[PDB]
Symmetry: C7
Subunit: 256 residues, 7 copies
């Protein structure tokens, strides 16, 4: 049984191969990390060399025990293929992960809409991103889904814009409405005066004349500015004699 | 018939091969489990070595009965392919399974919305997850579907937020509404006072002035707090003289 | 024509091959069935060995009539491929079949919603499942579709939950409504008293105060409990002086 | 030009090959049809042997005119591939065809809903099924589409169920409504008395109390039973003093 | 440079090959057309032989100028692949074309609904079908789209069916309505009397009792029969004292 | 280093190869354009020969510097594949481009609906088509999208058809309405009198009797004819005493 | 160990190969950039030569350490494949990037609708485009998504068109309405008088006669022209006695 020495040689090749592979791959993503690339892309690109070198080792090692070479390429091919399928979704998500962290279309703490759902971003991880809905629900979105959909970011821009739509009665003084509204926004300090300040008759409506007011503020103020400016419009308009109309209807009577 | 000895040799290879395969594979996911990896990933990765080694055995064993080697790679290729298709959905679900249990974006007992349907999670299994709808229906969702869709988790966060929208009549005192609402929530102990406490005029409405109240509570209290605070608003508002308006209509008569 | 003896040898190989194949495959799923596996998985896995072995036979048999070996792998490859396509849908459905019978996410006789359609399950067969809609229509759903969609099962759970929404007039006594409702459900024996018994003011509505009542019952009783508890609410509420309001409207007259 | 004898030999192989192929294939689906299999599946499976054998013939025939063997596998591979694409839809439809005829989830003459469209089935053919809409439109649905969608079959079940929803005025006697309805259905012979006979107060409605009546009849009677039972309810209810209410509205006047 | 004779031989092979290919292919679809097959299928199947034979020619011709054979299979493979992609949509449409013309699920001149759009068919061409919308728009639909979608054909059936829904006031005589309607349709000659003639009380409605009338006519008459029968119902109903009701409303006054 | 002469020979082959390739390809689509084919199809088919011939050159050229032949097929295969993906969308659009220009289902200047969006076509280019919306927006649609969707062409047909729907009061004379409408359209010269001229009672409506008028005109006139015929109907109907009704309502009073 | 010299030779090949690759590739996209092509397309096409040449180097280098050549094509094939998947989305986006910058269907600063979302474009980068919504949200859209969807460009066209729809009461003078509207737009300088100026009775409406006015202006003016022309219509119409009607209703009383 002097051809049972190849069994021992097969092992030798595997152990030497496993080590030679482990040390090259370590010594490659030592190189990559020292350049800059990116921790994950390093580990990934690296772990391909690793699994590649032990793929060569398996071919030559089995090969000394008469395993036909072109059967190892085939079996390992299949093996790899079966893994490949099972993972993929992951691989795809893993990649989106990188992209998101290395392009920061949103960063942790920004409020964003990631395709129907919107919340404050907490953390982008390997496969999935975590946000917290204004009301306290937690949503976990797959990195893959995020990256191939639109990213609406409420917070990256420093100055944003409220739009009021106020409806008043048809017999209201057009000039009077404009003046009161203009004088409300003029006096509000939180409204940026060096930007758009549109007060205008916008829509001849169903039962109301509809005025549009659009004014810019710092992103932080936007919410409070809206509320404060509204309370105001309502108060002033009442004291000034302008009517917010209920729904109207001309009825045309007929005794029968 | 001295070339009918190869038939006997073919069997020998198969039995030795089946055993040698069965004991390597066992001896691999012995190693994996002892590290940490994950029971399932172990069994899976392992069972690939297993089926791989008996793939080699089949090649060499048939090969001694003149089965052309490159016809075994082909036949087994097809066989594997046919299985591959038939399973897949499963494989994909199996993988989602792992991910879900080893990332716990939801754990058993959390209430969650898994893409349109929502219930309390019971158990994540091989291919499919089981939840119980608040009313007692059981839903079985495929692990695969779950993982590639958004996961809304109502329960992982410890503190959550009710939003009331209360409509009052246009001739109601703005300041009075705010005070009563503010004094209701101020006194409710279950409302977390160190967080958001928004009471504000929010919408000039169709037939009602709409106030928005938003207050935070422990996740457990949220449901009862809502109901209790509502009963309250209704009672106080009535005793205080504030009217929840019916739908309005100005009618403008015309005899014809 | 002494090279026309190979034609005779070709047949010999085919007949011996067909038989050798038929008897291994039989003798394999004899083994599988005797373990436990599953009748279909057996027949399937088995029928792959069968068609595999006669694939080898065809290669070697044609091969003795100078059919280039690597042309047989090719032709049979194509043949298999063409079949593969034509079936697949089937294969996919066949597999779903197994899963459904060997996981019983629904069993025959349970009422279920299988992605938009819902009915009482009759029988899960090879490719397709049969249910009967409450009203008598028969639906035939492909096993494949079922398994990759949500499965809502109305019947597996033994206790379920009705939700009534009752609207009463704004000027109705809040305490009185709660008491009558509570006293209706308290007295109904079919309502499980050791579970949720929610009677509460839920919605300040358009033209009605809306109370929500939620009570649990055995799955069998659920339908009759609802109807009986409703008839009751209506009767009691009338005799007690509480009004279910018609839609309301404040009209504000104007002679023109 | 003694190497121009191979041209003549090439032809010989083709003619012999075409014939040998044509007579095996005939002689295979003679066998299949004599077992039972199915006329179409036979022709198909058969026609694969046919085109397979002439594929071998083409390889060896061209091969004697120095056409490199592994170029024929390649060219024919491409040819086949180009056909494959062009057909497929067909192939898929052809297969659905079989399944439909050999499982009769609907048979000719049954009224069915095949994914949004519904009509009386006329005939299932090679690729496409033909139904006639109740009103006389003809619809041609691809067999493929049919098989991968739900099949709703109105006609296979012998007994089916009407549901009436009747709305009466709030001040109507609950007991009186139940009795009249019950006495209508009790007397109707076409209503199967040994099955469900539900008459019940079902919905406290907008402007009507809504009763649900559900009764079973033979599939033939279902349409006429509905109409006849309706005419009846209307007549009896009127003569008995029960009012089908018009839409209601409480209006609350305000001089301004 | 006596190895520069192969360049001349290469050309010879190409010219002879191009001609030998052009003349076989012509001589094949001469055969096909003389059987019956189908002008397009012939040209297609033929043009595959054509491009196949010149594929062999290119392999052997380049091969005498030392172009490694298995590089030609590769390059041409790619070339073909690139074409394949660019065309396909076409190929698919070309195939649908054939099917449509050789199954006439609609013929030129029939009015049909081809998945949302409907018009009178003009002409089915290579890739695309042309219809004319009742109002004069032209629509060009891809043959491929057509074939994989439902085909609704308004015109292939010779007799079709109108459905009138007529609403009359609740206090209208049920018997009188039925008689007038029945007597209208009885007298209309264009209504096929040997088929369905349904006049019945169908819906207890919002503000109207709704009668359904359904009557069959030749496909040509269907439009005019509807209009004529309608004008009629309106006239008769008026002269007979039956009221088509306006929308109703019971209003319940409240001085406040 | 007399084996460093192959490096020089490698270059020679590449330069000769690049030229020989460049001059065949030029000399091929010289031929194609001189027949008729199509400028783009020529350049494309041509540019495949070009890149094909330099693919052969690269194989043999590298091959003289010991680059294993079957590694060049592989590397170039990958390279081509990576390009292939990156382009494709383009390739697909490029092909649609051709089809559109060489079938003119719409030509520049026609108004068309290309799947939801509609505008006047400006120019069809390589990948993308440009249209101008009636109001002045520019839309750029990918050629690929266009070709696989329906093409609605408003302009290719020379004569088109308006449909008026006019609602009059229930107590209006049916005959009078028809006559006035008929006499309006009879007198309008721009209405084609040799085509459809439908004036008819079409719908017994909610609060109006609805008449349908349908009349054909040249494509240019269609818009103006509609407007002019409308103004007319309104004027005549008023002067003739026919009422366009406001929405109706029978109210049924109840003191409470 | 004189066969441990090949290890040293292996390294030599890699270093020489890496350099020879680095300097060809640099020297290729030196050439491309100097022509014109496109900075990105150059780097890409170039980086394929680069990775190709080191692919050859790896084959021959490993090959001198007995790594079977056809195992390197295989391993690297897999490696490449795994990368290929992980990237792709990127590759696709990268390509769309190019196309967008080198066709400028929108340029930075134009307002555009990119499939549902619309904003002012800021910058098109490698994979993703950034726009700013009128109100200050930032949207990040993948280049890939953009290129395969419609591109609506509000700004590339220099002159655009407002459409007013004004509703007046039925008893308003048709001629008077046309004149006032015509005289408003006639006098507005910002309205381009050499283009469309449509003032016309367009719709006989529910409770209003609806006039359509359509007038063209410079793209800059469009917004202000609309607002200014509206305020105007409202003012003039009031002073001139034309009534914008409230919703109408003929009510037909019935004492009960």
């Amino acid at each position: 049984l002097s051809y049972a020495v190849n069994i021992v040689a097969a092992l030798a090749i595997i152990i030497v191969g496993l080590i030679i592979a482990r040390m090259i791959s370590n010594a490659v993503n030592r190189l990559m990390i020292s350049r800059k690339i990116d921790a994950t892309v390093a580990d990934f690109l690296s772990a391909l060399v690793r699994y590649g070198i032990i793929a060569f080792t398996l071919i030559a090692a089995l090969g000394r025990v008469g395993v036909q070479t072109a059967s190892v390429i085939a079996v390992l091919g299949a093996a790899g293929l079966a893994v490949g399928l099972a993972l993929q979704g992951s691989l795809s998500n893993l990649a989106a992960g990188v992209l998101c962290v290395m392009f920061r279309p949103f960063r942790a703490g920004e409020y964003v809409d990631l395709g129907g759902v919107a919340g404050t971003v907490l953390s982008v991880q390997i496969f999935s991103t975590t946000m917290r809905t204004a009301d306290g629900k937690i949503i976990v979105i797959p990195n893959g889904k995020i990256i191939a959909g639109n990213i609406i970011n409420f917070s990256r821009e420093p100055v944003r814009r409220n739009e009021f739509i106020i409806g008043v009665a048809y017999d209201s003084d057009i000039d009077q409405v404009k003046q009161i509204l203009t004088n409300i926004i003029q006096s509000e300090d939180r409204i940026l005066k060096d930007r758009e300040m549109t007060v205008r008759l916008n829509e001849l409506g169903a039962s109301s004349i509809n005025f549009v007011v659009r004014v810019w503020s710092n992103s932080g103020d936007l919410q409070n500015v809206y509320w404060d400016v509204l309370e105001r419009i309502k108060r002033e308009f009442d004291a000034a004699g302008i009517s917010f109309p209920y729904p109207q209807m001309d009825v045309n009577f007929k005794r029968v």
